[PDB]
Ligand binder design. Sequence first.
Ligand SMILES: [Mg+2]
Ligand SMILES: [Mg+2]
Length: 373
Amino acid sequence: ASSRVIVHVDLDCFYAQVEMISNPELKDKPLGVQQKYLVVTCNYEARKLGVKKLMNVRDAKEKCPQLVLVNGEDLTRYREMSYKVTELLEEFSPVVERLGFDENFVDLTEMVEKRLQQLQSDELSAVTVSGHVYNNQSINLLDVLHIRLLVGSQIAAEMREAMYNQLGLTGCAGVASNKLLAKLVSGVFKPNQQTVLLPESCQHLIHSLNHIKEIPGIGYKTAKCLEALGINSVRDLQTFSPKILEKELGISVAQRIQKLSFGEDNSPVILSGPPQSFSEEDSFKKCSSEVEAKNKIEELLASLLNRVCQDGRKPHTVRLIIRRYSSEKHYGRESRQCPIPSHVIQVMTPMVDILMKLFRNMTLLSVCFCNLK
DNA sequence: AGGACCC
DNA sequence: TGGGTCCT
Ligand SMILES: [Mg+2]
Ligand SMILES: [Mg+2]
């Protein structure tokens, strides 16, 4: 149970794909999916015309005045298609980890070993790659790690084919020996293509990044820290004193991220299974006057009740989240949480009242059910 | 409850 | 600055 073969599957412009399937007439039009004042994503036609992920509508339309916009505030259809993709990949191999609605990791190691035991000491020399090899690296058919990663690429090509044939969806895949690398390599050829990373090109991929922030695992706060410390490139992080890093970020963060900077990442692909929470949100200018807007809270409620029904399991906890007024101090939302009574688990209106009291304990309103059982 | 990370 | 995860 040593060396792994992991695939990362990463769909193209996922919300825009879902909307193009729904309304074919948007098919070869540049398309942006809007949420409030943002174009959260857009199809590849629009990316050619300058439209970028998460651009304001204004910038978006004065870069491209012919841009078609559809509202993507209601996530229902995205969410449903997102689970269809996960279940299809689960069928290839059951340990599938979701990351957001349109990325999945699959640990292919058992699958690859089983396919390999199937082949003769004849056809092992006909093993070929499917799709791109990162950095155009030469394959060595006598290297058992090259052979396993190639079989990995063939399984990823089957997955992408099946997603297209069964669900109508295109996507990228990256095959590598761990989740970090699979995730960095999946993005090298886009849209709708795949890439496999052989071990000798690992430093090349890692040093191809232009800032430590691009490392999956290193976010906004951590990047700001490393900066303050004079750490900008992936090589700065590789060569920095482990000790000062430790005595500044904590042992956990320091040792994990410095391993990341080498391309090293032991984290297991984790079975996501069914979701741990269910929530819906609503943004607005500053429209929750702090009074008559429980009305919002009932709408949110009605949808969530229909969803959390549908699941089979039921939530034992409810939470209310808010965002307070005026100026924008970069970190700060607030939440009141209490258990749901069992009278009420097993007829909207008692739920309506719990929510209102937690409101009374305390631009954004959301309800979240959790602690599913 | 809130932080930090992800898409 | 419309969702989700897991750690502190
Ligand atoms: Mg992605
Ligand atoms: Mg994507």
